[PDB]
Structures are given as C-alpha cells and as structure tokens.
Design a protein around this ligand. Structure first.
Ligand code: CDL
Ligand code: FMN
Ligand code: SF4
Lengths: 56, 429
C-alpha cells in the first residue's frame, strides 16, 4: 500500500492488472483481534416440556 | 328420584353427631345402638355381607371402593392364621374431621360396627388405629369399649352369640401417611409408616402377616344400622352406585363451618347454603372449592353451580368426592398460595420410601413456592404439569397421586392467574 505512483504504474502495466485494488497483503480491512463476547443460541432440544428423549 | 338432599332426621344415622345427648352406653342404647345385635351375629357372615352389598355402601375413607365386595375377600376358610379387622381412625386428610365426631360422640356405633363387620369377615379382633393427636377422643372410645366389655356386648360370647371378639385401640404418633391402609398396618407392627406394595393384598397378608381388612371409621360405624334397617333402606338414598348418607365437613370461607350428615348426591351449592350458611360475602364471592379434601382437585365456581356431591358426579367434574371435606375459598383468596400450602403439607407427610414422591413432591413444592411470588417463566407451568404426571401412577401408594392432583387442578383452572403473577414479577424486576 506504500508503493510510489511510478512503481504502482510499472507493476500494473507489467502484470496487465490493477493490482492495487486486490492487494495480497492485508491491512485494516481485516476484523479486530478483540471481539465482543458472543451469546450462542441453544438447539431445539432445549425445552422444559414436551421433550421426552424417547421421542428424539 | 332425581333430586337429593333434605335428609330427614329419622333417616340420619349418626343421631349424636353434635354430642348433645349422652355418648356413653345408656345414651347409645336409648338411640338404637346395640339393638338385636345377637340376631345379626347369628344370621351369619353371608347374610351380613349380603346386606352390605345390597346397601351400595362405598368406602368412606377416600377411595370409595364398594364395601360389600371388599369385605367378601375375607369370607374364606381359615388357613390357621388369625383374622383381623383394622379400623382406620387416622383421620388425617386436611379439611376432614368427620371421623373425629363419630369417635367421641357415637363411639358405640363404631364398637358395634367393629363387632358386626368383624363377624362378616370372620375376624377375631378389631384394631382401631387412631391418630395420636386425638387423645381425648381415643380416651372416650376406650371408656365406651370398657362399657361394652362389662355389659358382655364384646369379648367372650359377644352379645350372647357365642362369638369371641376383642376391640383394641392403638394410637398413632403423628403421620398423615399412616392413614394409608398398608402404612397403618406397618405402624401397628411397630415400624415406620411406610406403605407396602401390592400384592400381597391385606386380605391375604396383612397385620402381623395375617388376613386383614382395613375399613374407615365412618364405613364401619354404619354397618350395624344397614343390617338393622336393611341394605334396601340405605340404597334408597342417593344416585345409583352412589348410595346412602354421608358425613360432610364444610370449612374455609363459609359463614358457619360445620359437620353435617346429608344425602349423597346433594348439590354442592345446596349443601353449602342450607347447612354452612352460604359463602362468606355471598355466593357470587366464591372463587373455588376443594370438594373432597386436600387430595382432590379444586373446581371453580362455574363448576360448583350444579355439581352433585357423589363419586361419579365429581369424577366427571375432573375431581373426586374423597372424604367429602369441602374447603371453600372466596374471591379474596390467593388461590396459588392456598394450593402451594397443600403441596407443602404433602412434602412434610411423604414417608420418603419411593423415589417419585420422595424427590418429586419436594420438587413440586419448590416450584410452587416460586409460582406464589411469580419468580418463574410461563414455560415452567407445563414443566410442572409434566412433573406431576411423572409422580402420579408411578409411586408405591396414593399419596403421590394425592400430591399431583391438587397441582393439576390449579393449572387446569387457574393458569391465567399463575401467568399474571409471573408477568407482574417480570415488571417489578
Ligand atoms: C534500478 C535502480 C533505481 C535506483 C532508484 C532507487 C529508488 O529510489 O527506488 C526507491 C523508490 C521507491 O520505490 P517503492 O517500490 O515505491 O518503495 C516503497 C515505499 O514507497 C518506500 O518507502 P519507505 O518508507 O519504505 O522508505 C524507507 C527507506 C527509504 O527508501 C529509499 O530511500 C531507497 C533508496 C534507494 C537508493 C538507491 C539509488 C540507486 C543507486 C544505484 C546503485 C545500485 C545500482 C548499481 O529506508 C530504507 O530502508 C533505506 C535503507 C537503505 C537501502 C539500501 C539501498 C542502497 C542501494 C545502493 C547500494 C550502494 C551500496 O523508487 C521510486 O520511487 C520509483 C522511481 C525509482 C526508479 C525506479 C526504476 C525501476 C527500474 C526500471 C525497470 C527495470 C526493471 C528490469
Ligand atoms: C396418604 C393417605 C392417607 C389416607 N388417610 C386415610 C384416613 O385417614 N382414613 C381413612 O379411612 N382412609 C385413609 N386413606 C385411605 C386408605 O388407604 C384406605 O383406602 C381406607 O382406609 C379404606 O377403607 P374404606 O374402604 O372403608 O374407606 C388414606 C390414603 C392415603 C394414600
Ligand atoms: S408415594 Fe410418598 S408416601 Fe407413598 S410410599 Fe412413596 S414416598 Fe411414601
């Protein structure tokens, strides 16, 4: 992401592609390495009634 | 007939219900007890069992089994063991207190019933099990028994009939469960009051491991009258298969809570208004009734308007006649708290023997306690319904059934009250 304009033009032309739009090096687009805590859902068998194991 | 009630006093069996006449032997004889008892004993068990069958008498201890057929289990040839009649005077069902009145005011009906009933069963003696709190009542019964011995009415050559019969009184020590027929037998034997599995049935292996019949105090005390006046006379009161007269207790929110004798199949409304003076605050102030003691499901006012007081009428209302103890709750009652307190009672009376009631009833109690405060979620209501169904029909004795039924009645007819209470707790938190 820090290539000079001349170098960006040179490598785009040599490859025949616009490489700057799809850089193979990652910067700030990736997700934060600290995330808010999850709250995961429970499955269909998490019920207090009409849930006898012999039916499932 | 199609209408019942308005029992005439000449048709009332327990003519000394209120203890306004001498309860001792002289008063009892003047009222018709002990009359022609020798002739009855000389007619033989088959004739005695025949009258009881024709009478349509059903067990007055709460389960309502046909008495004539039950007593006939004992009419078999002797195998060498003694045979016994155990009279269940445990009287422990909350709301119930009719057997207390017979024991202290008409004790000679019970003693004569023990002799007549014991003769039909071929028994040698009667053990009357009386709850230990009924100390004065047990003392009266004991004085009456002594009078009966001194007059030759019981004992060797009873009434001159040539039949030997003894009447023992043995007191309990504080346990509702000891009213259960096989727990009562276990208690007489000196053990903890834990019920037996069946089979064997008591008629084969009972008290001391002998042929035994357990009969309720009211059931036994009416047998001499049925024999004197005829099973046809008894069968002429009440609906078919619901024969006879019945002692009722009306307690709770009525003007004049009382014990009375009335015809079987009397309307519940008629019974409350004629004898108990009506519902506190009027009939429209009624919320629910528990018709047959704490073990029977409650019914709401809409059902009480027309329900008849007998076994089959109350089964169709999704409850039972039980002991015929009527606890009335008016509209000021916390119906959830009222039922919760009954579940607490069952938690304290469980003998603890078998898993579903030892664990389940205490579990139901904790859930009901939170339902009273509303500290629950509506999904727990169906959870509580399923829990009560895992106890009912899975336990050794009917106490587990008797705990599940009150809960099912509350959920059946008062779910919106339960849910509204949970909704209120949700806001205030
Ligand atoms: C070919 C020779 C070209 C000489 C030009 C050098 C130069 O300036 O390039 C860097 C400069 C930046 O390039 P970039 O890829 O964008 O860098 C990424 C960042 O922008 C860069 O930004 P930055 O933040 O990373 O900058 C920090 C960097 C600072 O970056 C620099 O200053 C690079 C300095 C390079 C100067 C070398 C001059 C050439 C001397 C000739 C001697 C060698 C040949 C014989 O700091 C350093 O690391 C410097 C440490 C010293 C590096 C050692 C270089 C010594 C080389 C000479 C050896 C002598 C012993 O290039 C340009 O700006 C484009 C014009 C330069 C001419 C390009 C011609 C390409 C060749 C034609 C195609 C033929 C292919 C076949
Ligand atoms: C927990 C429990 C308590 C009972 N208490 C009594 C009681 O106090 N008096 C009674 O007659 N029957 C009581 N019973 C019913 C007896 O087990 C039995 O059905 C009755 O004594 C039979 O006599 P009966 O046919 O004349 O009614 C109780 C049953 C249970 C399960
Ligand atoms: S149901 Fe309850 S009272 Fe009856 S035997 Fe089981 S634990 Fe004891």
């Amino acid at each position: 992401a820090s290539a000079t304009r001349f170098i960006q033009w040179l490598r785009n032309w040599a490859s025949g592609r616009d490489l700057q739009a799809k850089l193979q090096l990652r910067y700030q687009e990736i997700s934060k390495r600290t995330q808010p805590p999850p709250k995961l859902p429970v499955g269909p068998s998490h019920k207090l009634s009409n849930n006898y194991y012999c039916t499932r | 007939k199609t209408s019942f009630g308005s029992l005439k006093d000449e048709d009332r069996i327990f003519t000394n219900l209120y203890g306004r006449h001498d309860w001792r032997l002289k008063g009892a004889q003047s009222r018709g007890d002990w009359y022609k008892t020798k002739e009855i004993l000389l007619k033989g068990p088959d004739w005695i069992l025949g009258e009881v069958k024709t009478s349509g008498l059903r067990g007055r201890g709460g389960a309502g089994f046909p008495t004539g057929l039950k007593w006939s289990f004992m009419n078999k040839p002797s195998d060498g063991r003694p045979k016994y009649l155990v009279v269940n005077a445990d009287e422990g069902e909350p709301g119930t207190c009719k057997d207390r009145e017979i024991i202290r005011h008409d004790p000679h009906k019970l003693v004569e019933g023990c002799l007549v009933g014991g003769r039909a069963m071929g028994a040698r003696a009667a053990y009357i099990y009386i709850r230990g709190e009924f100390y004065n009542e047990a003392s009266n019964l004991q004085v009456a028994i002594r009078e009966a011995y001194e007059a030759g009415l019981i004992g060797k050559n009873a009434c001159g009939s040539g039949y030997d019969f003894d009447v023992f009184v043995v007191r309990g020590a504080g346990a509702y469960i000891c009213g259960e027929e096989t727990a009562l037998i276990e208690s007489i034997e000196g053990k903890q009051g834990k019920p037996r599995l069946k089979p064997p049935f008591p008629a084969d292996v009972g008290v001391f491991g002998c042929p035994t019949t357990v009969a309720n105090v009211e059931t036994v005390a009416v047998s001499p009258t049925i024999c004197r006046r005829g099973g046809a006379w008894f069968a002429s009161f009440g609906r078919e298969r619901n024969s006879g007269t019945k002692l009722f207790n009306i307690s709770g929110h009525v003007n004049n809570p009382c014990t009375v004798e009335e015809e079987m199949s009397v309307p519940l409304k008629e019974l409350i208004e004629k004898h108990a003076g009506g519902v506190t605050g009027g009939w429209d102030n009624l919320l629910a009734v528990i018709p047959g003691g704490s073990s029977t499901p409650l019914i709401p006012k809409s059902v009480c308007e027309t329900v008849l007081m007998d076994f089959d009428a109350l089964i169709q209302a999704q409850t039972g006649l039980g002991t015929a103890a009527v606890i009335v709750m008016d509209r000021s009652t916390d119906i959830v708290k009222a039922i919760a307190r009954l579940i607490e009672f069952y938690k304290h009376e469980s003998c603890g023997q078998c898993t579903p009631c030892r664990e389940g009833v205490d579990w139901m109690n904790k859930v009901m306690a939170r339902f009273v405060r509303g500290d629950a979620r509506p999904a727990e209501i169906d959870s509580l319904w399923e829990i009560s169904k895992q106890i009912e029909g899975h336990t050794i004795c009917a106490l587990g059934d008797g705990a599940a039924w009150p809960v099912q009645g509350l959920i059946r007819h008062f779910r919106p009250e339960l849910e509204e209470r949970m909704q209120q707790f949700a806001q205030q938190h």
